[model samples]
Structure formats: C-alpha cells, structure tokens
Target: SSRTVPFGDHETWVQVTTPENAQPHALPLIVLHGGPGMAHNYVANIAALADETGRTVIHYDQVGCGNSTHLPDAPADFWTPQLFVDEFHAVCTALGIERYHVLGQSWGGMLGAEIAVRQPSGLVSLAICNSPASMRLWSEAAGDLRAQLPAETRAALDRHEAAGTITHPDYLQAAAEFYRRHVCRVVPTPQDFADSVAQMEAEPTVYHTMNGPNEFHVVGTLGDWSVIDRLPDVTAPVLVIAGEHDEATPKTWQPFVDHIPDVRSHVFPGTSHCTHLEKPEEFRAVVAQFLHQHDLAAD
Candidate 1:
C-alpha cells in the first residue's frame, strides 16, 4: 500500500509491500533508490524480497521526485543530504518501524551511509549498493572510466562541455555510450529504470542542482560531499554490493570494506551498476541470505 508521510512542511510518498504470513522476526527492509533525484521505480525490483524472504519492503519517493511533493524552486542549500536523512527518519517514525534493514543504491546508498553513521535506533543492518563513500572518489573513478571511452566520444563530450552546451545531441550521444558501458549492461534497459529517467527529465530540479548536467559532470552542490570519515561510526552490519563494471569502481566502494568493522562485499561478474535488475534472482538470493543470517544472529 502507498501513502503520504509528513516531511517537514511537505509530504512524501511511501509504499510498503508486506508479504502474507510474513515471519514475525522478519524486519522490514527500507529500500532507497539512487539518483540524488531518481524516483523509487528503479529500485522496485528489490521489493521482491518481501515475498521471497517474508519481510515487508518499504519504498519511498524522496521529497522532490515522483509522487512526493516537488520543490522546483528550492535553493541548492535545500537539497543537502541531511534533508534526505531527516526525511528518512520521518518515514520510519510515521510507519512505526521498530526494526528495519536498509538497502540504498547509488546516491541512496550515500544517504543511507549518512543515516547509519548516526547510529539510529532500530536500524539492524545496512546495504550500500553501487555507491561511493565520497564524491571526490566518485569523480575520480568517473574520470578514469570516462577516459576509456572511444576517442571520438571523449572528444564530443569534451567539446560540448567546454562550449557549455551539455544538452547538445552530440554530448547526449557520447554520454549514452559511457552509460551503456558502465551504467546498465542489459540490452534493453528495464521499464522501471526508464521511467525514473523520464521522470527526472520532466522535472530535473533536484537532479540538476545536486548532480549537474550528466553523470560524469560534477559541478553541483554534492560534488564535495563525502562520508568516508564517518563510515566507522556506523554500528550496523554492512553489506557492500557492486558490479564488476560499475561506474562506482572498486576505489569507490573500498572505503566501506576498509572502514566498516563488520561488513561484507560482493561484486557481480559481467554486470554494471544495475546488478539487482540485471541479475535479479542471484541478487535477491544473496541479499536475502545475508539478511536472514544477520536476523537469525540478532535473534
């Protein structure tokens, strides 16, 4: 069921998928979608865990996107990571979630890590998927990946970016090449993924302000955001997941493994950033097993 939860002066959309006869100890799983602006659709695949593992899966369209209240005119300062963190807490409290696991992808993972660092009560475990601990690391890894693109593609990107015409067709084409190589390897991108992109295009206030024009360009407010120093403060068991060809390269996710005292890492072979969608069955199995073992241990 989907409902609106109060967030500051606005309300954000939240959906909870509860499996019938769910086990009593199966804590709710709160799934956070990526894209400092992408809606909840892209990460909807993870909701399958509710049925497969007998846990309620909660998905929310963060403030400013999807069914949530939109603040197109909000200043750059209004879109800070803390805004999302407070919003996450509001959703959990409104839902009366006494115990829960969190799975955040991309920017969502970044937000999740920020939240976990505070050691919030009732947060049992965390999963940071395809996200970097710091935007500096993200920018560096992106530059490395961008360098491997075809020369012509690289030139096109550079030309348009230099001319401040990032919206040009040539620039978009070049960006698509990079995306295909590291974003989602699946031949036909999933509809949910496409829907999120479309929504962002229709109302790009949040994304453009925080993520700049494209994935590789980092002129937005989040360009300097970093949580590397805070990773050790997270008290929950952590699971770090990524794709072998992920734009969030090993350097991006390594801090999670190195800093989090209790953490495990997984890299899906021949996959890019969207491993949950590209390898649904295996992704669900791995995540479910991890959550089950941790939940059992906690009990």
Candidate 2:
C-alpha cells in the first residue's frame, strides 16, 4: 500500500508491504535506502521480506528525493542528519509503528545509526548494511581502493578532478571503473538501481549539495560527518552487513563491530556494495535469523 505522510512542512511518500498473515510478534522492517538523494526504488527488492520473513516491510523516499517532497532550492545547510532523523521519526509515528526493525543501506545506515544512538523507545533492532561510521574512514578507504585502479583510469580521474571538470565524460568513465569494482559487481546493474540513478540525475540538488558529484568524491557539506564515538550509546542489538568488496570497506564498518556493545557482522563473499541485491535469498535469511533471535516478542 502507498500513502503520503506529513514530513515537517511537506508530505513524503511511503510504501508498505505486509505478509498475508503477519504474526503479532513480528516487528515491521523499515528499510532506509542509500544516497542522501537516491530514491527508495533500488531497495524496494527488500520488501519481499514481508512474505519471506512473515513481517511487514516499509520503504519511504526521504524528503527531496524520489516521490517525496523536493526542495530544489533548499540551502546546503538545510539537508542535515538531524533533518533526516526527524523525518524518520515522523514516518514511524505516522505509520503507527510502536516498535520496528531498521535496515539501512549505505547513507540510510548512517541515518539509521543516528536514530538508534538516540535510544528511541520503538527501535527494536538495527541492521546497518554497507555503511561507514565515519566519512574520514570512507574517504581513506576510497583513496586506497582508487589507487588499485588501472593507471589510465586513475590519471583521467585525477586530471578531470584537478581541472574542475568532474562532470566530464572521461571522469564519469573513470568513476564507473571504481563503481564496477566496489559499488555493484552484478554484470549489468539492476533496473531499480539504474532507475534510482536516473531519478537523482533529474533532481540532483540534494545529492550534489550533500554528497558531491559522485560516490568517491566528497566535496559536499557532509565530508566530515562521523558517528564512531556515538556507537556505544546505541542500546538496541545491531547487525552489520556488508559485501566482501564493498566501497564501505571493512575498516569503515569496523567501528560498529568494535564499539557497539551488542553487535554482530556478516560480510558476504563475491559481492560488492549491493550485496542484498546480488545475494537476495542469503541476505534475507541472515536478516530474518537475526531479527528472530532478537525478537521483542520472545521477551
């Protein structure tokens, strides 16, 4: 089912998928998509969990992206972590979700972690998928990974970036090389992924202002964002998931594993950033098991 919920001064789109006969004990799984600007389309595949795991799955397009309210002229400072955190709370309250599980992928994970650290009463568990706790860690890992790219690709990337021509086709081509290796290894990227990219291209104000031209380049306002020191404040059980070759490197997610008092992590092999899409069955299975183990109903 689809609906619009009030978010601050505007309304945001939400889609909910529920099992035919959801268990009373099953907490709804709220999915947060990546890209401060990427729509919820790519992560829509995760809604299958509503049936596979016998739970309801909720997906929402964060404000300024997808079907949600768009603020094309919004200032750079308008898009902050707190703005998203508030939007998340509004979604939960609007949906009447007294308790819910959170599965945040990439940028979504960062927002979800921010919410979890607040010790919200309704958050049952958190699944931080393919996300880093700090932008510093992400940039460092990206630099190391970029060095391993072909010399030609590296040279082109450096040239275009230095020339202030990052939008050049050559720069995009060079960026694609890194994306193929670290973003998504699937032979041809999924349609949903492509759709999300297209949507962002159409209205890139949020993305460009917050995350810059592409994934590797962090010239945006969120360049120094970090949540490592706050990990211990998260009281909910945490499950960290990532791909073997994820752009969110192991070092990037290690803080979640090391600092969270109750945390477990899984890294799927032979996959990149979109592990959930590349290994859907396995990803759902792991998430289902983790949720079951920590089900509040069991208490």
Candidate 3:
C-alpha cells in the first residue's frame, strides 16, 4: 500500500511493501532511489526483499519528482541535499518508523550519507549501493568509464558536451551506448527501470536543476558536492556495494569504505550500476543478511 507524507509545503509519496507474515523482530527498510529524480521504480524491485526475508520495505518518491509532487518553477538554489534529508526525516516520522535500515542507490546514496552524518536517532544501518562520496570523484570516475566508450561515441559526447547541446539526438544516442554497457547490462533498458527514466524525462525539474540531463553529464548544482569529510560522523553500520563495471566505479565509492566507521564492502562480479536488477536474488540475500545480523527484533 502507499500514502503521502507531508514535508513543508510539499508531499512525498511513500509505498510500503510488507511480507505475508512479517518477522516481528525484523526492522523495516527504507530505500532511496537514484537520479535525484529516478523516483522509485528503478529501485522498486528491492521492495520485494520483504517477501523473501519477512520484513517491511518502504519506497518514497522524494519531493518534486514522481507521484509525490512537482515543482518546476522552484528556484534552483532551493533544491539542496538538505531538502531531501529533511524529507526523509518527515517520512520516517509520519510513518512512525523509529528504527529502520536504509538502502540508497547513486544520488540517493549520497543523500543517505548526508542524513547518516547527522546521527539521526533511528538509523539502524545504511547500504550505499553504487554511490560516490564526492561529485568530483564521481565525475572523474565517469571520465574513466567514458574513456572506455567507443571512440566515435566519445567524440559525439565530447562534441555535444563542448557545445552545451545535451538535447541533441547524437548526444542522446551516445549516452545510451554508455548506458547499455554501464547502467544496466541486462539490455533493452528493463521496463521497470524504464518507467523511472520516462518519469524523469516527463518532469525534469529536480534533475535538470540538480544533475543535468543524464548520468554521463553533470553541470548542475551537485557538481562540487562531497560527503567524504563527514563520513566519520555517521554512527550506523554501513554496507557499501557496487558492480565491478558500474559507472559508480570502485574508485567512486572507495572513500566510503575508507572513511565510514564499522563499514564493509562487496563488489558484484559482472554487474554494473543496477546490480540489484541484474542480480536481484544475490543482492537481496546480501542486504537481508546484513540487516538480519543487526536485527533488534530478537526476543
């Protein structure tokens, strides 16, 4: 089932997936989707973890995107990291969720770190999947991945980016090439994930203002964003994950392993950005095991 949680003048759409007979001691999980605008469908498959592990999974579309709300006219400066952090807090409060695990992908992972550093009262554990600690590092990693693209594809991207014409069909085609190899290896752009992409294209206010037109490019306000310096402030146990060939390469999220206390990491072999989608069973197993190890539900 799904509902709305109020945040300031806006609302966040929250969807809850419950197991047939939930494990009483199992702490609920909240997932944060990527894109700063990918909404929830891309990572929505993770919600199925509830059925597999007897837990509750929550998915919420952050303000200004998805089914929650749209603020196209909102000022660019208004879309700060804190904006989503507070929105998360509001979701937790409105749902009366006092203890929970969090799983964030890409941009959402960045948002997770921001919230964790504040030492929020109820954060039990954090799973930062295919995310970076700094936008600078993410950009550098993107460069490395882009360099591996076909020479002609690279040139098309270069020509478009240099001329500030990301909207060009050539650039879009080039980006798709990079995406096929790095974003989702499953190919044909999985329909579930495609929904998130279509949603972003339909209403790009948050994304266009904060993260540019696509993942391969970044000229928005998050260009200089970083959270490496604040990693130590996080008190929750953290599980860092990434696909070996992901756009968020090992180098991109290494700072997370280095800086966060009580942390461990796993790199899924032969996977990319959407490791959860590519290896759903394996991904859910790892996440469920980690959260179960930290379970406060034991009688």
Against the true structure, candidate 3 reaches a TM-score of 0.93
Model 2 off-target regions past 4 Å? 150-152, 155-171, 296-298
Q: For residue 188, give model 2's deviation from the true position in Å.
A: 1.6
Q: Which lDDT tens digits does candidate 2 get at residues 23-130?
A: 768888999998989989988899988988789999999999999999998888999999999999999999999988999999999999999999999989999999
Clashes of each: 0, 0, 1
Each candidate structure's TM-score, on Cα atoms with residue i matched to residue i, is: 0.94, 0.94, 0.93
Model 3 clashes, total count: 1
In the range 145-213, model 1's lDDT, one tens digit per residue, is 878888999999889988999889999999888888899988788999999999999999888888887
How does model 2 fare in lDDT?
0.90
Which scores better on TM-score, 1 or 3?
Answer: 1
